[model samples]
Target: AAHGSNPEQLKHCNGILKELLSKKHAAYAWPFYKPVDASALGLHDYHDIIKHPMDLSTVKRKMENRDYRDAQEFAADVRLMFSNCYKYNPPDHDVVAMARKLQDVFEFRYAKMPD
Candidate 1:
């Protein structure tokens, strides 16, 4: 029940999320700004493969709604977003490259956050 109990922790995690989304043209960031339209994109198995689909906008909404239990939980969702891209796309796909860049940036900032 001690999930996301700290206001400072929530603020820090939200800040990290904002910073990541603010990076324009950050290695094809458009792909992650919102939820993926698997049907429109003709990705038949996308839903089956990426069971836990995630995106920056979803995370932002979650943060705004105070849904995370902790900073680590917030970071976990971010990682899940990147992980979904890797799982659904080929290794050489452009989205994979973009997800990697954003993932690296998120991890770097998350690690640097104050305790």
Candidate 2:
């Protein structure tokens, strides 16, 4: 489950999972088959599907906050997003590797911006 305080971050995390899953041969063959219930995963609830993009916008606002504390909080939220990706999709080296890469990219971008 995503530990982020921001709902959008959680949605973004789930989006990554869904995207990765869609790329796999098994998943592609069975587009309707969801291996895991997203709500059960604690990333998002059924209602979240509709408002996810809004939540991401909120997350971006948090990310752009000038307050150092707010920036830190946003960074932490992003970290949680990636952490959840690693958790639900365990043991898949490709998924793990991609998550790690994204985590690094996120951290770098987060760090480069002035707080």
Candidate 3:
């Protein structure tokens, strides 16, 4: 309950995450739902290409663990997730398309968050 004494922001940030994972955003959420497995996916160069790999589940965990300082910090990780997708996948790839869609929504919602 402590949450670094910023429970309000935590709740707000988590609410935004929930919106991103809602049914409306579900279409573009699959690709970013979990961490990428380089070995299983045969993406041996994935780690090399994406030095700061991130995913939605990881973001959830970090939020629960109170690892974020504010909504801005949380937004950074979400942006990082999409940026990593862009960096590793081809521009024309479906994953890139999904990332773009979700990233756009996330940015819009994040920008509207209260200070």
Candidate 4:
């Protein structure tokens, strides 16, 4: 039962999570916002993923100590990032699911798979 046993990995993965969670605009499979374009995607000129600072202790603490906010909290935060023109919401917008997704990403990126 060696789940969540690594700190550096946790921080790095959470950094990635912070980066992903910041993308509250698009939930669609294609044309996240508009035809996979940059300006249309609301990323502007800079790199879209690096818009938020993830490699900070503050970000890690925020992920770990979330104050027990519910999925609605997560949904609300992500939902608010969308433009008034781009109205799209999927049925699977869940905090727990997203959390699980982060864990999956962490395992894949940090740990070596057993043969």
- The TM-scores, one per candidate, come to 0.90, 0.41, 0.88, 0.23
- Candidate 1 Cα misplacement greater than 4 A, ranges: 1-5, 24-27
Per-residue lDDT of model 1, residues 23-110, tens digit only: 5545567799999998999998899888899999999999999898788789889999999998888999888988888888788878
Rank order (by lDDT, best first): 1, 3, 2, 4
Q: Give the clashing residue pairs of candidate 3, or none.
A: none
Pairs clashing in candidate 2? none
Model 4's TM-score against the true structure: 0.23
Q: Model 3, 55: alpha-carbon shift in Å?
A: 0.3
List the global CA lDDT of all models.
Answer: 0.85, 0.45, 0.84, 0.37
Which residue window of length 10 is worst by lDDT in model 3?
Answer: 1-10
User: Which should have the higher lDDT, number 2 or number 4?
Assistant: 2
Measured over all alpha carbons after superposition, the RMSD of each candidate to the real structure, in angstroms, is 1.9, 11.4, 2.8, 12.4
Error of 1 at 110 (Å): 0.3
- Report the lDDT tens digits of candidate 4 across residue range 1-115: 3244344444554554454544542242112222223466564643434333222233335457863133333333333333211323233545334434543443354344221
Candidate 3 C-alpha lDDT tens digits along 38-100: 899999999999999899899999988989877668888999999988888889998898888
Better of 1 and 3 by TM-score: 1
Error of 4 at 34 (Å): 23
lDDT of 2: 0.45
Candidate whose TM-score is highest: 1
Superposition TM-score, candidate 1 onto the true structure: 0.90
Where does model 3 exceed 4 Å of error? 1-6
